[PDB]
Structures are given as structure tokens and as C-alpha cells.
Amino acid sequence: GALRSLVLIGHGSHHHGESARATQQVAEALRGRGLAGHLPYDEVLEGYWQQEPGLRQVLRTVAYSDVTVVPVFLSEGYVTETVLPRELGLGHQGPVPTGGVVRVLGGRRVRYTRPLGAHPGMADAIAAQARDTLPEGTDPADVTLLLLAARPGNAALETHAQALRERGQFAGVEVVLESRESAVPLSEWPSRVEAGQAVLVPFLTHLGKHAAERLQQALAQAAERFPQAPPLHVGGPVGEHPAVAEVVLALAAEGREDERGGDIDQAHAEAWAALRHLAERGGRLGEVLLTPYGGLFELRHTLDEGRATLDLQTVVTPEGLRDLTARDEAGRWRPIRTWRTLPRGWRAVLSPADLRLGLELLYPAVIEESYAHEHRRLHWTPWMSTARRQTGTLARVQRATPDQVDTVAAQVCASCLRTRLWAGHTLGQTIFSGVPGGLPCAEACTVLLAAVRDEVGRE
Amino acid sequence: GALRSLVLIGHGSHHHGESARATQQVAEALRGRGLAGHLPYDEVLEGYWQQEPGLRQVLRTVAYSDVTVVPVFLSEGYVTETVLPRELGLGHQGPVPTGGVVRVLGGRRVRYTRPLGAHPGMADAIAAQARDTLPEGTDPADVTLLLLAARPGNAALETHAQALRERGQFAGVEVVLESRESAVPLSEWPSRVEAGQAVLVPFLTHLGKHAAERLQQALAQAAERFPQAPPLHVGGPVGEHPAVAEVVLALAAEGREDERGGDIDQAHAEAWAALRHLAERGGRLGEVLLTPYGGLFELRHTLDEGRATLDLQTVVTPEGLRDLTARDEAGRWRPIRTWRTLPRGWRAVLSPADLRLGLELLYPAVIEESYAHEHRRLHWTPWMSTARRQTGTLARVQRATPDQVDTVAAQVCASCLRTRLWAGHTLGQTIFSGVPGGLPCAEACTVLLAAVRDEVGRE
Numbered sequence: 061g062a063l064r065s066l067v068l069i070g071h072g073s074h075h076h077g078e079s080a081r082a083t084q085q086v087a088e089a090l091r092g093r094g095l096a097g098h099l100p101y102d103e104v105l106e107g108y109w110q111q112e113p114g115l116r117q118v119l120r121t122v123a124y125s126d127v128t129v130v131p132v133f134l135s136e137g138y139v140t141e142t143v144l145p146r147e148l149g150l151g152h153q154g155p156v157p158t159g160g161v162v163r164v165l166g167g168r169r170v171r172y173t174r175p176l177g178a179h180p181g182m183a184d185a186i187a188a189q190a191r192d193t194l195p196e197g198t199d200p201a202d203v204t205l206l207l208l209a210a211r212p213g214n215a216a217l218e219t220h221a222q223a224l225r226e227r228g229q230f231a232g233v234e235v236v237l238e239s240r241e242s243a244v245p246l247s248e249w250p251s252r253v254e255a256g257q258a259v260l261v262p263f264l265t266h267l268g269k270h271a272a273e274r275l276q277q278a279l280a281q282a283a284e285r286f287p288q289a290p291p292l293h294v295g296g297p298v299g300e301h302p303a304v305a306e307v308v309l310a311l312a313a314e315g316r317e318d319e320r321g322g323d324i325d326q327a328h329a330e331a332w333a334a335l336r337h338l339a340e341r342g343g344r345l346g347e348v349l350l351t352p353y354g355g356l357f358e359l360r361h362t363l364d365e366g367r368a369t370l371d372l373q374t375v376v377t378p379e380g381l382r383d384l385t386a387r388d389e390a391g392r393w394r395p396i397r398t399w400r401t402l403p404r405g406w407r408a409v410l411s412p413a414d415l416r417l418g419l420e421l422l423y424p425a426v427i428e429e430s431y432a433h434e435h436r437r438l439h440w441t442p443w444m445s446t447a448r449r450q451t452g453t454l455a456r457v458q459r460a461t462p463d464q465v466d467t468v469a470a471q472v473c474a475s476c477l478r479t480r481l482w483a484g485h486t487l488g489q490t491i492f493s494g495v496p497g498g499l500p501c502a503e504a505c506t507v508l509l510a511a512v513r514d515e516v517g518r519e
Numbered sequence: 520g521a522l523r524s525l526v527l528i529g530h531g532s533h534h535h536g537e538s539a540r541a542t543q544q545v546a547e548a549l550r551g552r553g554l555a556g557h558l559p560y561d562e563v564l565e566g567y568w569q570q571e572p573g574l575r576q577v578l579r580t581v582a583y584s585d586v587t588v589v590p591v592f593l594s595e596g597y598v599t600e601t602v603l604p605r606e607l608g609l610g611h612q613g614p615v616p617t618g619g620v621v622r623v624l625g626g627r628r629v630r631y632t633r634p635l636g637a638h639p640g641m642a643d644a645i646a647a648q649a650r651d652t653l654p655e656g657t658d659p660a661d662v663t664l665l666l667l668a669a670r671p672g673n674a675a676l677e678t679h680a681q682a683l684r685e686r687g688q689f690a691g692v693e694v695v696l697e698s699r700e701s702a703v704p705l706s707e708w709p710s711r712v713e714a715g716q717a718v719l720v721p722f723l724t725h726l727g728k729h730a731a732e733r734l735q736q737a738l739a740q741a742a743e744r745f746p747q748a749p750p751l752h753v754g755g756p757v758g759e760h761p762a763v764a765e766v767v768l769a770l771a772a773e774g775r776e777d778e779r780g781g782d783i784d785q786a787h788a789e790a791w792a793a794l795r796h797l798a799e800r801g802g803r804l805g806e807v808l809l810t811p812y813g814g815l816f817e818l819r820h821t822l823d824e825g826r827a828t829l830d831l832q833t834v835v836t837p838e839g840l841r842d843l844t845a846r847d848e849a850g851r852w853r854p855i856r857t858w859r860t861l862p863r864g865w866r867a868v869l870s871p872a873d874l875r876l877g878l879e880l881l882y883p884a885v886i887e888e889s890y891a892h893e894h895r896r897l898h899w900t901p902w903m904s905t906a907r908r909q910t911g912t913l914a915r916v917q918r919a920t921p922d923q924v925d926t927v928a929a930q931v932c933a934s935c936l937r938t939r940l941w942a943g944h945t946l947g948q949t950i951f952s953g954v955p956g957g958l959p960c961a962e963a964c965t966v967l968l969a970a971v972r973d974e975v976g977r978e
């Protein structure tokens with residue numbers, strides 16, 4: 061009853077899975093330590109800007125009254141200083157204090173940290189990535205370290221670069237930058253490597269395919285210009301290296317003000333007790349069938365009821381269930397997990413201990429929002445409140461007519477299991493009073509907002 | 520024990536519902552009479568070119584071994600002479616003579632008639648619509664009868680226009696043409712009227728919203744060009760008039776070489792015996808929950824399991840159920856009824872006598888195909904064979920590579936409940952083995968053919 065939640069925030073995407081992969085990797089590694097007894101947290105949850113579990117939903121999902129939120133982002137700017145605290149409801153803008161933003165929201169102590177890329181331990185993670193990218197014999201002393209920035213003035217990266225120069229285990233360290241579409245152009249890298257070899261580490265959480273193409277073109281330009289250039293070993297993005305989890309832990313601690321921890325959140329616990337009572341009877345939630353299976357719980361798609369075990373792909377972890385359900389049957393990403401697009405073909409066998417994380421990853425926010433609606437205490441947010449928060453390209457949703465929003469919502473939300481309470485639709489029973497398809501929507505989602513944007517820009 | 524089936528064939532659509540409502544209106548009227556005892560057919564079924572029940576499916580749905588197929592088309596031309604016979608598998612092209620084309624296919628004797636538009640009874644239906652359209656005091660001999668054709672070469676309508684002149688009930692009779700996108704265009708109609716009034720009857724099964732705006736547009740042009748034009752009364756499409764049912768009956772009767780009749784098709788009868796068995800125990804079929812309800816049956820969406828009965832819209836006829844499931848929750852047409860897009864919010868209560876029609880209109884061909892697959896005898900048609908039947912802009916599907924079709928099918932078919940047997944996908948268990956989402960796909964559908972056409976076109 062000194063209990064604490066860690067939340068990790070990633071960018072996410074409507075379309076590309078890689079963009080959640082760094083957050084999901086680190087989350088699972090830290091839970092792993094929790095299983096082993098070396099985690100100063102009692103749970104590790106995820107939230108995303110551009111998919112579910114969303115920024116607006118993530119504090120509804122935390123089990124405990126003491127929460128630490130760490131941004132798994134490598135730059136300090138718009139997204140981290142404006143977008144994430146605004147969507148989180150932290151009422152803060154601009155530079156984050158070292159040590160973080162401390163708030164009281166819900167019945168909850170929340171502390172929002174500086175981003176991952178700001179922590180000095182990122183210099184260690186870079187160096188480790190670089191050494192792991194080399195071939196079995198090679199003295200780093202003979203290797204020049206190239207650090208690939210995503211944008212021009214990443215002040216943190218320059219700092220890490222100078223730390224690694226001083227520590228002196230590389231022949232040299234250069235910051236490289238791809239051109240358009242002062243740091244050294246990647247297309248020129250051999251002009252800076254007079255002897256030995258080079259190694260490239262992207263200072264990136266991940267590498268999407270357009271980005272990867274920009275990069276290999278840059279390198280092909282280099283090689284055309286310098287046809288006998290040093291051997292170059294190209295690493296993966298530092299955001300996927302195992303060391304980032306240790307950096308996340310250091311960031312999470314620095315700035316902590318109170319050492320007491322928190323307590324369990326009662327509303328949340330009540331929701332999950334109801335969920336357990338249902339799982340024990342057997343029951344259905346969305347497109348998922350839950351079946352007690354001795355001392356375990358099986359989950360499968362309701363369409364796959366009665367289907368032979370060996371005609372299914374079985375998993376036995378919450379994470380493997382998440383992964384199997386991340387894309388639809390065409391292989392396309394599912395950013396809104398309540399969409400009526402859950403793929404067939406899978407089975408999950410879960411321990412009683414793992415059931416909650418399993419459902420929370422499969423259907424984020426649904427157990428808690430449903431239970432709250434069942435008991436008429438789900439408060440929802442009108443379109444106007446949502447539209448008025450948006451900045452960037454999304455601010456334009458503010459000039460959508462109520463006809464435009466209804467028309468777009470009719471089309472978008474038809475794909476979804478939820479009922480759009482924020483648009484005046486009503487929901488009388490939920491998953492907790494017998495109805496598998498009875499799920500509340502409390503607020504216009506990121507896929508709806510983008511569609512309204514597009515409609516508004518069509519003129 | 521002389522048993523016979525009538526099959527009505529319409530155009531249908533991927534996107535719009537009018538193009539089937541004419542066929543559905545006639546079919547439903549004729550089933551009503553068959554209960555009043557006043558029908559020479561023991562069932563009335565539907566099939567469509569561009570939606571389910573499709574031309575490839577409809578004959579497998581017929582209960583009897585003697586079948587009459589009437590095209591509800593107001594033309595007699597390439598579509599009725601070449602396309603419908605080719606898709607139905609009749610082994611016929613060109614002119615169909617009065618009395619039909621007779622074939623033995625499967626176990627059935629099938630007679631394919633001339634189209635609705637070719638029967639001389641259509642003059643009576645046109646006159647009746649004309650009379651109904653006049654201010655009900657009006658005297659016909661004071662009125663010029665204008666007949667709107669879709670396209671220029673409607674020789675059948677010209678035949679009728681001449682019969683109606685000879686009857687003489689009207690001041691005169693002229694054909695005019697829908698606007699492009701030597702009978703005179705509708706925008707010139709007063710050039711063909713010498714009486715002091717006119718009545719326009721569209722020789723169409725239906726009038727979509729596009730074509731309706733264009734008709735209004737043409738009428739505005741006529742009114743400017745001819746400020747002296749007399750008053751025009753505008754009737755709806757003749758295809759929607761109750762008098763068309765009597766013409767269909769007359770067409771069905773012409774040429775029945777005999778008055779013997781047929782027997783029950785045993786394969787079809789077996790599949791419905793299997794379904795009845797499943798129904799008395801309660802079962803799930805795709806996205807539908809089938810429950811014994813005393814001596815009737817209840818159907819609802821599986822997502823609505825447990826939902827309060829009074830929160831649902833109740834229907835009690837197969838046709839009502841069909842109408843309520845015709846569109847998705849965005850109001851978009853569902854041409855392929857096995858798509859995972861069945862709307863929520865309804866319940867059907869059906870007598871045992873209505874169960875089969877109910878299920879056949881809700882999910883065309885699913886019962887029979889599923890039954891046949893479990894008995895290891897569902898015959899599938901390979902892609903290249905489908906592609907090769909096609910003509911026009913659609914023949915372009917013939918250019919798609921195996922990878923191109925595999926790529927489009929993964930994207931399109933992801934929306935579908937069915938498993939593409941024709942593409943080498945296998946299905947080990949169907950609805951009849953207790954798997955709600957186990958449904959076979961025996962042949963590429965019109966929605967997938969159009970998607971492959973667009974892909975080839977884009978590349």
C-alpha cells in the first residue's frame with residue numbers, strides 16, 4: 061500500500077506498427093523485471109498519441125493513485141511540451157523542469173518526466189548499440205561513430221555526442237543529418253573518416269520505411285562520391301536497444317518528491333472485480349469469447365467458437381495476445397482496438413494473474429469505461445471541447461459544421477463497436493449487463509479527428 | 520405434387536438500393552398471392568447481377584427441380600441475351616424466343632424467359648401508370664403519352680409505343696431519351712406534343728438520385744426552350760407499378776410446354792434439414808444468433824445477445840429482416856451479405872414456414888454451400904475462369920497477375936466472413952460444425968472483380 065504505476069508514452073500511428081514497437085519493447089522488459097522482483101513499480105502501462113491506448117484514456121487505466129509518466133521520445137519540443145501534457149490534462153506548456161511536472165489529477169499524484177532523449181544515460185545506450193553493430197573482432201578505437209539526427213538542432217543529441225567524444229572509446233564521433241525532402245550531411249560521411257571504419261547509430265525510437273529510404277539514398281550518394289570509402293556498419297535505431305529500459309528507470313526516479321507510493325484506485329479495482337466475475341461464468345466482450353479453462357482462462361474470437369485447437373495459433377502471454385490482435389486479416393494496423401476488425405485464427409491461454417494485462421492490452425480502456433457507464437458515472441466530452449484542444453493541422457477541425465461532424469462520424473464510427481455518447485447516441489446495457497457489443501465511447505478519437513480534418517480540407 | 524420455383528433476376532448494385540427494389544417489390548407481391556392460393560409457383564426467389572443473391576448462387580438456392588427464370592429488365596439486348604445466360608451457366612447467347620430457352624442444369628429443368636421489357640403486357644402497365652399519374656379527373660384522350668428511354672436503341676419500347684397508339688386512349692405516343700453524360704431528347708419534349716397536356720412515363724425499373732436530377736435538369740431545359748409548352752405530369756418508373764407482377768406471370772406462363780411440374784431437389788432439401796436441426800438447438804451463423812422462441816424462431820445480431828427485447832426493432836417477415844440488414848451502420852449498401860458489417864439493433868421473429876426464406880434473404884447461399892462443403896462436394900470456380908467470362912471495362916481483370924489478385928483479395932476479402940476456397944485457402948469446419956465464422960467462398964464475387972479492375976487500372 062505503497063503502490064506505484066509507471067506509464068510510458070509513445071508516438072503510435074494509424075498505419076505503421078514500428079512506431080509503437082519501442083514503447084512496447086521497453087514496457088515488456090520492465091514487466092519482466094517486475095516478475096523477477098527488481099522493479100520499483102507495481103505495473104507498467106502504455107499510452108500513445110496516435111493510437112489506443114490513447115493519452116486521454118491512460119489515466120483511467122492506472123491501477124494505483126501514484127503515477128509516473130515517461131515520454132519515450134528522443135526530442136524535447138512541440139509533442140512533448142505542448143501535445144502530451146495538454147492531452148493528459150496536466151495543464152502545463154513549454155519546457156519541462158528537470159525532475160518533471162508534478163500534478164494532482166483524479167484521486168492521483170501524477171509526475172510527467174522529461175523525455176527519454178534528454179537523459180545522459182542515452183549516451184551509454186548509443187555506445188552499446190554501436191558496439192553491438194560491429195563485427196566480432198573490432199577495436200572501437202579504429203571505428204568512427206556517426207550519430208544520425210532526425211532534425212537539425214537536437215540539443216540533447218549534441219550533448220550525448222560530446223559526452224561520448226570525451227569518454228574516448230571511439231576514434232571520433234560525428235552528428236550526421238540527412239538533407240531536405242551545423243551537423244555533417246550523411247551523404248558526405250567519408251569526408252570525415254580519414255582511417256579505419258565507421259558505424260552509424262540512428263538517434264531514433266524506430267525507423268519507418270520512408271525514413272529508411274531517405275537514409276539508404278544518403279548512403280548510396282556517399283558511396284557514389286567515394287567509391288573506396290571505409291567499411292560502414294549500419295546499426296538499428298537506438299530506441300530498440302535493451303539499455304533504453306535502464307535509462308527509462310533512471311528518468312522515472314529523478315525528480316521524485318514523495319517516497320510514500322500510493323494506494324489502489326477503488327473504482328478501477330471494482331471494474332476489474334466485475335470483469336473477473338464475468339470471466340469466471342464465461343462471457344463475451346466485443347468480438348472476444350472468454351472461457352474458464354480449469355485454473356486458466358482461454359480467449360478467442362467469437363467467430364472461432366468451436367474451432368479446433370490445432371487450427372488456431374496459441375499464445376500464453378498478454379504481450380503475444382496484443383501482437384496477434386494488432387493487425388486485421390488484411391495485415392493492416394488497428395489503431396482503434398474496438399473496431400469490428402479483430403482477426404480470426406488465434407487462442408490465448410492466460411493465468412489468472414495475467415488476465416487483466418491481457419484484456420487491457422487487447423481492448424484498452426473498455427473494462428473501466430464500460431463499468432463506469434454501467435453505473436452511470438462515465439462522463440464524456442463534447443466534440444467542441446475536443447476540437448478546441450487541437451493544435452497543428454488538427455486545429456482546423458474547429459471549423460467543422462455539426463453537419464460535417466455527424467456525416468463523418470456516421471461513416472467512421474460504423475466500423476467501431478463503441479456507441480458515441482459524445483454525439484448524443486445512448487447506450488443502455490453494456491458488456492457488464494449481458495451485451496457483448498455494448499461499449500461506450502466517451503470522446504471523439506484520433507481516427508475520427510483526422511477524418512473530420514480531411515473532410516474540412518476537401519472544401 | 521407438381522412443384523415449381525420462379526426466379527426473378529434484377530440488375531442490383533454495389534452502392535445503391537433502387538436497382539433491386541423493383542425486383543424485390545414484384546417478388547414480394549407474388550409471394551403474397553401464393554399464400555392466398557393464387558400462384559402457379561411454390562416459391563419465388565431473387566437473383567442479381569451486381570449483388571447477392573448472385574447469378575452464380577441463385578440456382579443452388581431453388582427448392583424444386585422445375586425452375587422458370589424471368590429477367591426483370593426493361594431491355595432486350597446484350598445483358599439479357601449474353602451476360603445473364605453466361606453467368607447463370609445456360610450455354611446460350613443471342614435472341615431468346617417467346618417461350619424461353621430450356622436447359623437441364625444440375626438436376627433441374629430451367630426455362631429462361633424473355634425479359635419483362637419484351638412482353639406485350641408492358642403496354643398495359645405503361646397505360647396504367649400513365650392514368651394513375653393524371654389529376655384524377657383528367658381524360659386520357661386530352662393527354663400525350665411520353666415514354667422515357669435510358670439509352671437510344673430501345674426497340675422493345677418502340678414496339679410498345681406503337682401498340683399504345685393503336686389502343687388510342689391517349690392523344691398521341693412519343694419516345695424521348697434520358698440526357699447523355701433519333702427519338703428526341705427529353706430536353707426537347709414539347710417538340711413532340713400537339714395536345715394541350717402531356718404525361719411522362721419512365722420505361723425504367725427504377726430511378727436513382729443521379730438520373731432523377733438529370734431528368735429534372737432536362738425538364739428545366741425543355742421549359743426554357745419551349746416557354747409555351749403544355750403542363751407535364753411526371754410519373755414514377757413503370758417498374759414500380761403493381762401491374763408489372765401480372766406481366767411477369769404472363770411471361771412465366773408463355774411456353775410452359777407442359778403443365779406437369781417438378782419434384783423437391785434432395786440436395787437443397789438436405790441442407791435445410793441440417794439447418795432446422797441447428798435452429799431447434801439454438802446456434803450461431805456468421806454474425807447472427809438463432810434461438811428457438813417457443814414454436815417460432817428469434818434472430819438477432821450476436822453483438823446484441825442479452826440486449827433488452829424492447830431496445831430492438833422487431834420484424835416478423837423475411838422481407839422485413841432483409842430490408843433491415845440491407846445497409847450497414849453508416850447506411851451504406853451491403854452487396855455482399857457475408858461482409859462483417861451486419862447492423863445492430865434489430866430482432867426477427869419468424870414462423871418455421873418463414874425460416875428458410877428469412878435465412879436465404881439474410882445470407883444468400885450460405886446454408887447450401889456450407890452443407891455441401893461439410894459433405895466434401897462444394898465445387899469452386901478458379902479465378903481465371905471467372906475473369907475470362909467478363910466483357911467490357913471489366914475484362915481488364917484478365918490482365919491481373921497472380922500476385923495482383925492475391926494482393927487485392929487479401930485487402931477486399933478481409934471484410935468478408937467467407938474463406939476463398941478458389942484461392943487455395945482451406946476451411947476445415949463450417950457453421951454446421953459449430954464454427955459461426957466458418958463459411959466457404961466458392962468463387963470470386965463482383966465486389967472483388969471490380970477491385971481487381973481498379974488495381975490493374977491504377978497500374
Ligand code: SF4
Nearest residue numbers: 473476478501504505
Ligand atoms: S469516435 Fe467513433 S471510431 Fe472513435 S472510438 Fe469513438 S465510436 Fe469508435
Ligand code: SF4
Nearest residue numbers: 932935937960963964
Ligand atoms: S471473393 Fe472475397 S469478398 Fe467476395 S464473397 Fe468471396 S471471400 Fe467474400
